[PDB]
Write a protein that binds this DNA or RNA. Structure first.
Ligand SMILES: *[C@@H]1O[C@H](CO)[C@@H](O[C@@H]2O[C@H](CO)[C@@H](O[C@@H]3O[C@H](CO)[C@@H](O)[C@H](O[C@H]4O[C@H](CO)[C@@H](O)[C@H](O)[C@@H]4O)[C@@H]3O)[C@H](O)[C@H]2NC(C)=O)[C@H](O)[C@H]1NC(C)=O
Ligand SMILES: *[C@@H]1O[C@H](CO)[C@@H](O[C@@H]2O[C@H](CO)[C@@H](O[C@@H]3O[C@H](CO)[C@@H](O)[C@H](O[C@H]4O[C@H](CO)[C@@H](O)[C@H](O)[C@@H]4O)[C@@H]3O)[C@H](O)[C@H]2NC(C)=O)[C@H](O)[C@H]1NC(C)=O
Ligand SMILES: *[C@@H]1O[C@H](CO)[C@@H](O[C@@H]2O[C@H](CO)[C@@H](O[C@@H]3O[C@H](CO)[C@@H](O)[C@H](O)[C@@H]3O)[C@H](O)[C@H]2NC(C)=O)[C@H](O)[C@H]1NC(C)=O
Ligand SMILES: *[C@@H]1O[C@H](CO)[C@@H](O[C@@H]2O[C@H](CO)[C@@H](O[C@@H]3O[C@H](CO)[C@@H](O)[C@H](O)[C@@H]3O)[C@H](O)[C@H]2NC(C)=O)[C@H](O)[C@H]1NC(C)=O
Ligand SMILES: *[C@@H]1O[C@H](CO)[C@@H](O[C@@H]2O[C@H](CO)[C@@H](O[C@@H]3O[C@H](CO)[C@@H](O)[C@H](O)[C@@H]3O)[C@H](O)[C@H]2NC(C)=O)[C@H](O)[C@H]1NC(C)=O
Ligand SMILES: *[C@@H]1O[C@H](CO)[C@@H](O[C@@H]2O[C@H](CO)[C@@H](O[C@@H]3O[C@H](CO)[C@@H](O)[C@H](O)[C@@H]3O)[C@H](O)[C@H]2NC(C)=O)[C@H](O)[C@H]1NC(C)=O
Ligand SMILES: *[C@@H]1O[C@H](CO)[C@@H](O[C@@H]2O[C@H](CO)[C@@H](O[C@@H]3O[C@H](CO)[C@@H](O)[C@H](O)[C@@H]3O)[C@H](O)[C@H]2NC(C)=O)[C@H](O)[C@H]1NC(C)=O
Ligand SMILES: *[C@@H]1O[C@H](CO)[C@@H](O[C@@H]2O[C@H](CO)[C@@H](O[C@@H]3O[C@H](CO)[C@@H](O)[C@H](O)[C@@H]3O)[C@H](O)[C@H]2NC(C)=O)[C@H](O)[C@H]1NC(C)=O
Ligand SMILES: *[C@@H]1O[C@H](CO)[C@@H](O[C@@H]2O[C@H](CO)[C@@H](O)[C@H](O)[C@H]2NC(C)=O)[C@H](O)[C@H]1NC(C)=O
Ligand SMILES: *[C@@H]1O[C@H](CO)[C@@H](O[C@@H]2O[C@H](CO)[C@@H](O)[C@H](O)[C@H]2NC(C)=O)[C@H](O)[C@H]1NC(C)=O
Ligand SMILES: *[C@@H]1O[C@H](CO)[C@@H](O[C@@H]2O[C@H](CO)[C@@H](O)[C@H](O)[C@H]2NC(C)=O)[C@H](O)[C@H]1NC(C)=O
Ligand SMILES: *[C@@H]1O[C@H](CO)[C@@H](O[C@@H]2O[C@H](CO)[C@@H](O)[C@H](O)[C@H]2NC(C)=O)[C@H](O)[C@H]1NC(C)=O
Ligand SMILES: *[C@@H]1O[C@H](CO)[C@@H](O[C@@H]2O[C@H](CO)[C@@H](O)[C@H](O)[C@H]2NC(C)=O)[C@H](O)[C@H]1NC(C)=O
Ligand SMILES: *[C@@H]1O[C@H](CO)[C@@H](O[C@@H]2O[C@H](CO)[C@@H](O)[C@H](O)[C@H]2NC(C)=O)[C@H](O)[C@H]1NC(C)=O
Ligand code: G88
Ligand code: G88
Ligand code: CA
Ligand code: CA
Ligand code: CL
Ligand code: CL
Ligand code: ZN
Ligand code: ZN
Ligand code: ZN
Ligand code: ZN
Lengths: 693, 693
RNA sequence: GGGACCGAAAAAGACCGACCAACAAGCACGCCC
RNA sequence: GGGACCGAAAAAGACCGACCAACAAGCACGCCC
């Protein structure tokens, strides 16, 4: 087996060295330091033995705090005395006190503002938290500064929900409930967030546009850019993140209504009152934000490496992950970048020996991912036609670890059998599973709710570089990392903090680098099999199985309004019919895939094209309603949470909060249109697996 | 040569028989007679030896006059006496007096109405005729019934221009200037239009949508249909066509301003006054329209025949033309349908002998073409994914003859060398070119203004079934017919009339059926070479050459406003750069295409894919501004004339009547955006011919 | 035969830039003499 | 230890239709006894 040779070349010691190398200085997007690391990686990928390695540059809107006018929040009395100020920077950790160019905590793409007003606590600032605030508790965030805890949903959605509720400011904070694991110590004595720690992060609502100034087209030297006024997904109110020390100061004086229930209570010793404003004596004190961050068009650099295929060089398997970090990127993304580096070194050594993959492999070091997947998206916009004609698969390589418990896999159903087979051939690195397969340890620790005796594999939404490839271009996509046990949908405590260091990983997450090595074997083994298997390792029958579940589910969600379904003759008959047809046609294609002569290079290429193009058949060039860059009809991010994936997203969005809609007849009409589009698309996808003539 | 064998099987006597067979009763879209002819063709294509022949049906909006409430126009006095009525039907021709189910003259998809008002003569009802009316002559069509002569532009554009000018009715008539050739006799004694003859035809503005009720998706059994109120491209005022006898009655009494110049004067003995209203005594007489036509969802039937390829069955060459007619379709479309039938019979005989084409050939008998390319477009919407993945080329087969002078070819630059080579190997059927090539007779009678010693090949716009394939899906497309000498952009006198018969073709156009045979050799030979050549016969260097002409042209058109170009820094630098790059890359790809080993089936398929997908690279999924179904960045129909093709249509539309625009800065900004999109698209297309890895 | 207007890129055709660092503007077909 | 509110499909998980011709609704984790 040529794969074992590849897997056995992968070394935890190499991953450890590369991780150390990538995490000693910050590599913020648009800074000289990240350009220097780009050039280092280009130079090393050549040395490692790639056929070519180019820098692809774009000029994209980034966001930076003003160094000589810092961002801070104040409690301010009616005399205008700033009696309490939030931190200007995170207290640096041991052996990082002398490190310059650490960007202070800030919300990227915040507008400028000095708004002052009454504080309203809005929990996680989810759609349902504003439904609870405004519909149930009759509280009105209009003209108020909202304070929200990080977690559950993408922070950009929180800011969007806040804007729609009339807020003039958003304060984001990390609550210990969400970012402090019980009975482990603050950094540097453990992996928990200290009270001065702050999660940086962008607050855009791009819905897959990439660079806000150049939607649809690469941000090249001659690009026509939108005015900032019509730029895509910019927030319209100021936003700033703080730690829980600073957050306790703002929250302790809160008056107005008590929290409705336990779902609104964090772990600080404060009442978690909703407001608006402060209790009793303090009622005439306000909160005032001071945001002077600037948006500016800055050059970014993707590293693109090529290992040309010996047989099908016009078929591309892509292994891509970002290089840019908020500070050191100890986990996010250098734990992924270090795995990609060792995978390149290892494919490189096989190349020097005189081995080549069947299909071309592309390796990508993406830039400006933290600013909204900007490097991956601009490159895909530049190369969309080649990618749609030639793209076999995309394997993501962000953070390798967010925990040390078990494997977490999100991929297209086309990769389910590949992932099952591979993890059965890999050793588990898990305590008490010595001599067992990764499949067994994974299936045991994370069983599928959907499939008895199978491991959980989740849906792809967005919030990483795979998005343009999968959701816009319909290229089969996969990601795998090590994760914690499920506190849930919050992340890891030290996410986007200065405390996210080399030492955090080495001391607390993966001292042996065995989890890193297992993830390198999963990502690398998947790339290997996609690039080298004679018949592409995609099982169309796994798509058939999940399409029936998604159809059962979307019917079930519509059935929340079963009287309306009757009034407006809402039928899923066409959708169930299409799924039944896909199942039958996939079954017959599978017979032909087993039977045919794989020595016939022309019949092989035909059947490989049918497999490669199956994911493309789910792409609608018109896109989903009000989201033209989300074109996959089976999968899209939640409108309300970029991180979360929905099945039959067109129907799902049409159904969401439908009982609120003023014109029932039109709203249910849109539901029936989306059933039509979905049934048509499933039948069309099925027909690509039919006999070609 | 296997092609000669195919060409020598084609027989003029067979085409004559089939033409007779297809033109004895009307075959209007949606009628039992056209269903019967569909089934006949399905049955004969099987007998001829196709591997399979299916009927593909759709339920589309068609339009019919009410049989028991006829359409007519009246001159009406202030007492409300209808003193003059227009014809209720065309006087039938000799030997057609006893023929039932001849649809009376009507404008398909006219709304219902009995509007009464003053007549304004608006010439051809072109954009420039309303600019002349409203800007120069200060005449105001608001609330007036407009009368317009057929010709120059698609009648649907005339109705659109009229609606935008505030007209409440449109009367279309055939002026002898445009539809009566000097010194030839009216049917049946010649090929000229008699004074009772009327051109039927649809008046939609679909801009490539297909069925008005189901834009983007096939009109299948479970389709969600728009309300008639939001249906695509329906006219909002009543419209009716009349002959020149009836038109003289309406035009003779016209008062108001004289015609501005000779360009407004037809050939009737009337003054061609503009109005509004009638002269002197007659000023209080009005015109009143009576339209009771109904729109209704009707089943239509495409015939789809397959000849599976022996080597690349997943590569499709399509030969398609419509079957539906306004009445007998003596020319339009049965002169084309009869050529397709003989091409099928001939491919069929080769199949029986045991020959197969390398690539699959699809044969299509399209329905409801006269109602807006509805059959071709719904089928393409159903099969868009297969067509984009597998479609090599589309050859149209509407009317084979509109004249007996020379060849007329409109195709992608990718087919220029194929067409040159083929016409050099075919005999000219032309008087005084006995023993010469069709290339020589054609080049002589129709020299290229663009290329010394080359024949004219024009651009594809719309107004036929190739549109969805080329303008929406980016499949390389071609058409060839015999045409008149250039009276121009009017058609042939008996177009869409009851007088367009078998006898018209047999007596006056092509008694020997030698023009039909030459067109069958061109269409059939092109299909043959596309389906059978080892290397696809596309020369990318012909695209390079024309892209430089189009760039020179669009620069030239922008330079009408050269001061504004400076004020707003409008530069074509990027566009010229992209074209220079395409030229260089196409030149190198051409070297590699000549050098490589064609015995390597995998290197051949790679290079054939690069050629096949080159046309697809010009497709923008976002579509052109305000025209989402026109996605080709190099070619689109004129916004003002569906029949006419524009190069760099995005830039062209942005520049059109720019000096009228209230915000110069925004309008010129859109021009710069379209330069950007065009340069990006040309560079992207060029890069698909680069080495793949 | 001669003359007058026009034909707003499907230019119908032919041809023609440094006191906007080569791609505007400007000689067949169909009321007067 | 027991109890109470909540967790609005990434359902966290398990399980459960003819006086809307099988796919609503309805038993782990984080003030009172
Ligand atoms: C993941 O792993 C699963 C489990 O192994 C795997 O499924 C299996 O794939 C193999 C390989 O195609 C299947 O093998 C075949 O079985 C059928 C009978 O059911 C045989 O007809 C096939 O015939 C062979 O004979 C040819 C003679 O010309 C040989 O040259 C040729 O190589 C064939 O081996 C063949 O034996 C097997 O049936 C399945 N098993 C199951 C339970 O499905 C799957 O392919 C892997 N998936 C991915 C995406 O990697
Ligand atoms: C339309 O017609 C034109 C005019 O014929 C045609 O262009 C020609 O195509 C041929 C076929 O490819 C070209 O032939 C080649 O010329 C180059 C030298 O310039 C040679 O290197 C090529 O080599 C051959 O040697 C191989 C040995 O392994 C042979 O096996 C192989 O078959 C090759 O023949 C070859 O001779 C020719 O140069 C051009 N001529 C011109 C003027 O361009 C064009 O291909 C046709 N286009 C379409 C779309 O049909
Ligand atoms: C991460 O690792 C890379 C790769 O080893 C380090 O960069 C490299 O550092 C080496 C050794 O110091 C450099 O070699 C030297 O360069 C200097 C100046 O050009 C020269 O005078 C010396 O004689 C020696 O040859 C090398 O330039 C450089 N390699 C690359 C590809 O950039 C990098 O500094 C490490 N980073 C951290 C933070 O540890
Ligand atoms: C929170 O931060 C703000 C801003 O840094 C602090 O308020 C500021 O305090 C400075 C220094 O005392 C004030 O400046 C002074 O102004 C007078 C002239 O008017 C000058 O002569 C003094 O010598 C002094 O420099 C400034 O007015 C004031 N600004 C604002 C907007 O409040 C605030 O004190 C901090 N709060 C805490 C609790 O630390
Ligand atoms: C899945 O595959 C099946 C089987 O090929 C498809 O079934 C077909 O469904 C349509 C109805 O949607 C049937 O079409 C016709 O409808 C008219 C209605 O007036 C009727 O007159 C015709 O006789 C015919 O019934 C068609 O018969 C039926 N075919 C079979 C064999 O059942 C189905 O539509 C596919 N699903 C999707 C979503 O495409
Ligand atoms: C155009 O040509 C077609 C093909 O020849 C004509 O239709 C066909 O007419 C033949 C000869 O009349 C039919 O054969 C006969 O059918 C009847 C009734 O089914 C049967 O009783 C006779 O013994 C004889 O077999 C044949 O059905 C039919 N073929 C097809 C494929 O439709 C058609 O009528 C011609 N149309 C015109 C307007 O000339
Ligand atoms: C143009 O066509 C219209 C409609 O066919 C003609 O006008 C119509 O003429 C009929 C027959 O004379 C009129 O009907 C009559 O009505 C009275 C009762 O009111 C009845 O007793 C008579 O016996 C007669 O049938 C009808 O009113 C009238 N309709 C309209 C809308 O005008 C018109 O005469 C035709 N014009 C020419 C020049 O042929
Ligand atoms: C057609 O192909 C040429 C040749 O590869 C492409 O040329 C490249 O054009 C860009 C400018 O648009 C140059 O990029 C860079 O711009 C920054 C500006 O700050 C500058 O700092 C860099 O040094 C660099 O000049 C690039 O140098 C240039 N390459 C060459 C070899 O001339 C051209 O863009 C392609 N055309 C299109 C439309 O893609
Ligand atoms: C960062 O903040 C500083 C200080 O407020 C800004 O510097 C000022 O710039 C404007 C000129 O545009 C001047 O009016 C002020 O006098 C400047 N002040 C100082 C101390 O230099 C600076 O422009 C900001 N940087 C940005 C917006 O990028
Ligand atoms: C929530 O409070 C806001 C802010 O006071 C209300 O908006 C205003 O309502 C008045 C009366 O209709 C308008 O005339 C003002 O223009 C609004 N003020 C601002 C600053 O926008 C809002 O109506 C309240 N919403 C609810 C649902 O009670
Ligand atoms: C690495 O793995 C260890 C061992 O599983 C994790 O520590 C345990 O966490 C559980 C509950 O999640 C506690 O009940 C135990 O007290 C811990 N076990 C031991 C042996 O200490 C640790 O949390 C993991 N590290 C990270 C960063 O996730
Ligand atoms: C065609 O026109 C006739 C005559 O005007 C229409 O027939 C009428 O239909 C309505 C019922 O919808 C009745 O009110 C009238 O009494 C009918 N008249 C006659 C003589 O039958 C017919 O509906 C029209 N056809 C259409 C619209 O398709
Ligand atoms: C052309 O005539 C129409 C119709 O009379 C004019 O439109 C009307 O103008 C008045 C005065 O502004 C409006 O109040 C009416 O509502 C219009 N009437 C209708 C029936 O629409 C129109 O303004 C004239 N256009 C020009 C450019 O002179
Ligand atoms: C078929 O071809 C004939 C011969 O070219 C066409 O008739 C001539 O038309 C020219 C001008 O266009 C006249 O000057 C001659 O009087 C005609 N020649 C002869 C020999 O009569 C005829 O128009 C063509 N038929 C059609 C339908 O286009
Ligand atoms: O903007 C996005 O889509 C996500 C960016 C980034 C993803 P990462 O933190 O890099 O996993 C974030 O969540 O802040
Ligand atoms: O609607 C169209 O695009 C054109 C239909 C038809 C084309 P044809 O007459 O069939 O050439 C017409 O012009 O009326
Ligand atoms: Ca972009
Ligand atoms: Ca449609
Ligand atoms: Cl990842
Ligand atoms: Cl045609
Ligand atoms: Zn990341
Ligand atoms: Zn991140
Ligand atoms: Zn036609
Ligand atoms: Zn027609």
């Amino acid at each position: 087996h040529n794969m074992k040779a590849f897997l056995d070349e992968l070394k935890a010691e190499n991953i450890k060295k590369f991780l150390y190398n990538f995490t000693q200085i910050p590599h913020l997007a648009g800074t000289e330091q990240n350009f220097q690391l780009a050039k280092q990686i280009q130079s090393q990928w050549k040395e490692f033995g790639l056929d070519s390695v180019e820098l692809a540059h774009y000029d994209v809107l980034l966001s930076y705090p003003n160094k000589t006018h810092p961002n801070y929040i104040s409690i301010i009395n009616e005399d205008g005395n700033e009696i309490f100020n939030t931190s200007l920077f995170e207290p640096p950790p041991p052996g990082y006190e002398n490190v310059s160019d650490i960007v202070p905590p800030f919300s990227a793409f915040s507008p400028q503002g000095m708004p002052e007003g009454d504080l309203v606590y809005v929990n996680y600032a989810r759609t349902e938290d504003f439904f609870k605030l405004e519909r149930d508790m009759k509280i009105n965030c209009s003209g108020k500064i909202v304070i929200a805890r990080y977690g559950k949903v993408f922070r950009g959605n929180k800011v969007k929900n806040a804007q729609l509720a009339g807020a003039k400011g958003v304060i984001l904070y990390s609550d210990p409930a969400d970012y402090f694991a019980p009975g482990v110590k603050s950094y540097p004595d453990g992996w928990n967030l200290p009270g001065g720690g702050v999660q940086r992060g962008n607050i855009l609502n791009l819905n897959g546009a990439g660079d806000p100034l150049t939607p649809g087209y690469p941000a090249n030297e001659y690009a026509y850019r939108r005015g900032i006024a019509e730029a895509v997904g910019l927030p319209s109110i100021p936003v700033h993140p703080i730690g829980y020390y600073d957050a306790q100061k703002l929250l302790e004086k809160m008056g107005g209504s008590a929290p409705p229930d336990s779902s609104w209570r964090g772990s600080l010793k404060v009442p978690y009152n909703v407001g608006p404003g402060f209790t009793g004596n303090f009622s005439t004190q306000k909160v005032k934000m001071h945001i002077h961050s600037t948006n500016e068009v800055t050059r970014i650099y993707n590293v693109i490496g090529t290992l040309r295929g010996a047989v099908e060089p016009d078929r591309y398997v892509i292994l891509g992950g970002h290089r840019d970090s908020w500070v050191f990127g100890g986990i996010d993304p250098q734990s992924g970048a270090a795995v990609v580096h060792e995978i390149v070194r290892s494919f490189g050594t096989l190349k020097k020996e005189g081995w080549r993959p069947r299909r071309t492999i592309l390796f990508a070091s993406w830039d400006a991912e933290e600013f909204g997947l900007l490097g991956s998206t601009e490159w895909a916009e530049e190369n969309s036609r080649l990618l749609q004609e030639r793209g076999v698969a995309y394997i993501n390589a962000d953070s390798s670890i967010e925990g040390n418990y078990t494997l977490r896999v999100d991929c297209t159903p086309l990769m389910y059998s590949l992932v099952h087979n591979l993890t059965k051939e890999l050793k588990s690195p898990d305590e008490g599973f010595e001599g067992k397969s990764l499949y067994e340890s994974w299936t045991k620790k994370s069983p599928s709710p959907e499939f008895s005796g199978m491991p959980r594999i989740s849906k792809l939404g967005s919030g990483n570089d795979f998005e343009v490839f999968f959701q816009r271009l319909g290229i089969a996509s996969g990601r795998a990392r090590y994760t914690k046990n499920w506190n849930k949908f919050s992340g890891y405590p030290l996410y986007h903090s200065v405390y996210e260091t080399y030492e955090l990983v080495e001391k607390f997450y993966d001292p042996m680098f065995k989890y890193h090595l297992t993830v390198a074997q999963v990502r690398g083994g998947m790339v290997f099999e996609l690039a080298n298997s004679i018949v592409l390792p995609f099982d169309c029958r796994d798509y058939a199985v999940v399409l029936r579940k998604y159809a059962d589910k979307i019917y079930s969600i519509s059935m929340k309004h079963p009287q309306e379904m009757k009034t407006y003759s809402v039928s899923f008959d066409s959708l169930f019919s299409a799924v039944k047809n896909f199942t039958e046609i996939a079954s017959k294609f599978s017979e032909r895939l087993q039977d045919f002569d794989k020595s016939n290079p022309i019949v092989l290429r035909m059947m490989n094209d049918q497999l490669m193009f199956l994911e493309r058949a789910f792409i609608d060039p018109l896109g989903l309603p009000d989201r033209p860059f989300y074109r996959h009809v089976i999968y899209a991010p939640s409108s309300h949470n970029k991180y979360a994936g929905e099945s039959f997203p067109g129907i799902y969005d049409a159904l969401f909060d439908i009982e609120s809609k003023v014109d029932p007849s039109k709203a249910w009409g849109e539901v029936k249109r989306q059933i039509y589009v979905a049934a048509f698309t499933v039948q069309a996808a099925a027909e690509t697996l039919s006999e070609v003539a």
